Design a protein around this ligand. Structure first.
Ligand SMILES: O=C(Nc1cccnc1)c1ccc(Cl)cc1Cl
Ligand SMILES: [Mn+2]
Ligand SMILES: [Zn+2]
Ligand SMILES: [Zn+2]
Length: 454
């Protein structure tokens, strides 16, 4: 009645030995946690990274949020940590006429869903979201020519130090060289009561991992990957405005929506309260949303394992159908790993090899097709040197790398090989096939992976 909390997501407590390697652990829990989309991880009791900061010297620019269900918000767009904390505590305290730890979590949750559904309530809140920088940096220890205490050095190279997470060797998004500040650097989040994150999935259907450093809990709702399209169909009917096409990746539209509405339409939803010192992990294509119980501080990062490689290819294909912008070229990343095959982890090498074989075979067929459309001329082209905005398919907006079609008529414009008929009105013999690699260059790159994998 009014609000029925979804069932709880899985909670794990690895031993020190299980904990030691994050990637092995995540691969272990995967068959369970991927059925629920999110899961929670409780570190061994003595794993306690030192959080230390001065609340007066950390400044950030606040974002403002209106709290209305089904209302469109844009995905991305002055306080000290002390002044924000004072505003946030006074707010919660005045809203309930109680001291902040006496407000039960069950009640804030019930109340959140009441106020977002009521339109005569126009509550607005503020929050912080930014990637680490000089005015505001990681909550985890990092190196800087500042002297560190022995406990800080202990955690400098932890797998679960979220700064290290991308650039480890069982990851695949670290090898990328056309790097993407938005996607491999950690984000910092300063919460207050009711500040919230709308329903969404990660760029390129990656994993994410979130650590609550300190403060009051963060409440999560999560949907398994297999149900992504059920949820999207429910969202199209109750709010189709969120689905009209958008001109940038900085223009994505997202919304707040009651999980009971989704459960009514047969979408499986799970929940959890994440407390200080706990991790939440989201799996590929797993929708999630939530809100903060009070003043808190969190840090999160995207990441990609070898498990994800096939999904990452299917995702880029799905972006093409939707005419959605890519953050990076998936094929470019594969070929970069192939070119460094000798220094690759061997399980990585083996899984990259399988994806490369699919890539090569799809590319063969696409080139045959455009040759039969009458495109004859061709020239090698180093796509990775072009700024991303200079190599998107005019039609579907995919980031080109393996190949593209150009014409002297439209200088600078490209189409991917799926959209040869969308470039211009000249006859095909006026077109050129631009390609990064011949098929003969590609088969030896794949062979290097086979050898490294043995
Ligand atoms: O908080 C956010 N995103 C988030 C948080 C936790 C899990 N997934 C996603 C967020 C990110 C960017 C901006 Cl401009 C605003 C918010 Cl409010
Ligand atoms: Mn997220
Ligand atoms: Zn032309
Ligand atoms: Zn295209």
């Amino acid at each position: 009645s009014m609000f029925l909390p979804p069932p709880e997501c899985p909670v794990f407590e690895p031993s020190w030995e299980e904990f030691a390697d994050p990637f092995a652990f995540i691969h272990k829990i995967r068959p369970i946690a991927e059925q629920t989309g999110i899961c929670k991880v409780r570190p061994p009791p003595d794993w306690q990274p030192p959080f230390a900061c001065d609340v007066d010297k950390l400044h950030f620019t606040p974002r403002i949020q209106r709290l209305n269900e089904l209302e469109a918000q844009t995905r991305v767009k002055d306080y000290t940590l002390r002044t924000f904390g004072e505003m946030a505590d006074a707010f919660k305290s005045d809203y309930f006429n109680m001291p902040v730890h006496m407000v039960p979590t069950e009640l804030v949750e019930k109340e959140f869903w009441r106020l977002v559904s009521t339109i005569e309530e126009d509550v607005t809140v503020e929050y912080g979201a930014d990637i680490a920088s000089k005015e505001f940096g990681s909550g985890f220890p990092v190196r800087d020519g500042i002297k560190l205490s022995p406990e800080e050095e202990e955690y400098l190279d932890s797998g679960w130090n979220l700064n290290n997470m991308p650039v480890m060797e069982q990851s695949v998004l670290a090898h990328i060289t056309a790097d993407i500040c938005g996607m491999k650097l950690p984000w910092l989040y300063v919460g207050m009561c009711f500040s919230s994150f709308c329903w969404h999935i990660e760029d390129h259907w990656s994993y994410s991992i979130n650590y609550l450093h300190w403060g009051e809990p963060k409440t999560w709702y999560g949907v398994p990957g297999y149900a992504a399209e059920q949820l999207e169909n429910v969202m199209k009917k109750l709010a189709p405005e969120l689905f009209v096409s958008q001109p940038d990746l900085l223009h994505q539209l997202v919304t707040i929506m009651n999980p009971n509405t989704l459960m009514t339409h047969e979408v499986p939803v799970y929940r959890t309260n994440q407390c200080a010192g706990e991790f939440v992990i989201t799996f590929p294509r797993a929708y999630h949303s939530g809100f903060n119980q009070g003043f808190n501080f969190a840090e999160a990062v995207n990441f990609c394992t070898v498990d994800w490689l096939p999904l990452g290819r299917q995702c880029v294909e799905h972006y093409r159908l939707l005419h959605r912008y890519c953050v990076f070229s998936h094929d470019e990343m594969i070929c970069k790993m192939a070119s460094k095959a000798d220094v690759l982890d061997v399980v990585v090498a083996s899984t990259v090899q399988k994806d490369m074989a699919i890539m090569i075979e799809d590319e063969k067929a696409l080139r045959e097709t455009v040759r039969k459309l009458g495109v004859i001329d061709s020239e090698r082209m180093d796509f990775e040197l072009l700024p991303d905005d200079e190599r998107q398919c005019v039609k579907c907006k995919t980031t080109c790398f393996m190949s593209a079609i150009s014409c002297s008529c439209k200088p600078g414009l490209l189409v991917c090989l799926h959209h040869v008929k969308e470039l211009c009105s000249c006859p095909p013999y006026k077109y050129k096939l631009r390609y990064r690699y011949t098929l003969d260059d590609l088969y030896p790159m794949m062979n290097a992976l086979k050898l490294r994998a043995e």
